[PDB]
Amino acid sequence: GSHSMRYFFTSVSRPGRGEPRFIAVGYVDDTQFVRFDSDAASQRMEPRAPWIEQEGPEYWDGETRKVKAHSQTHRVDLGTLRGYYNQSEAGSHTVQRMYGCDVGSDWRFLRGYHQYAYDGKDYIALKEDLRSWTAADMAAQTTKHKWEAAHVAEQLRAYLEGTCVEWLRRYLENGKETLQRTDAPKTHMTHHAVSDHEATLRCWALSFYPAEITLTWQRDGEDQTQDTELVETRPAGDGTFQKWAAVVVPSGQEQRYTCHVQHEGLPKPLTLRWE
């Protein structure tokens, strides 16, 4: 199907404890492949997937140089944002940045993005035309003015439409065994009484890739959205994912309830039944 490359950057001020924390991670789809950690000893961009280890020394030296430039900008940004919002040195604050590109099943460019957040909420984001900005408040408007005058969007568009997709395709080919695979979920339902008149029905999906999946309960064909407990899709640790959805039902009504599983690795959506 479609594919994505995304870089995630987390920057955290640490009042009275010196330099801020800086963590960068890169993903292709749901597979991480690089990291940089300001608190680690190496001070290098490091591999986190087997298929990126084959990149040569120029790759690792260059990515280390560039991630440190990201770190330096974010270090300055924390001070700038203190000024924009008239905030004291006493509090810790969080900057997050995410950018990347998506391609379709034909591997052609679908969309690019670059999003920036301060203390957990939208700050500024590149719009989908890759030519203009959405500024979430008045402080972000200041950034917007500065980024328009410095033609930041034009350089970002060139990266997102060119470099980003070219290297995403390279990674997809070099790691095709890992990245171009689909593991269909292994599904079942469990049944456990919570009393003499009610039972928990839990619909399970295991060992699937990629992480995108939909689990739904129906009662006589009607969606049970408000009565379903749906846990966050979670990593198994081996490159696959797990998820479950549960309802609590009156004992004896089990046959009314069906679980429905959607995943791109299934030939067709699955319906699991108690009869």
């Binding site: 870089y7 990515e63 560039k66």
Partner: peptide, 9 residues
């Protein structure tokens, strides 16, 4: 790979 230009906010 990363983008090479990272302009300050």
């Amino acid at each position: 790979i990363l983008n090479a230009m990272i302009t300050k906010i």
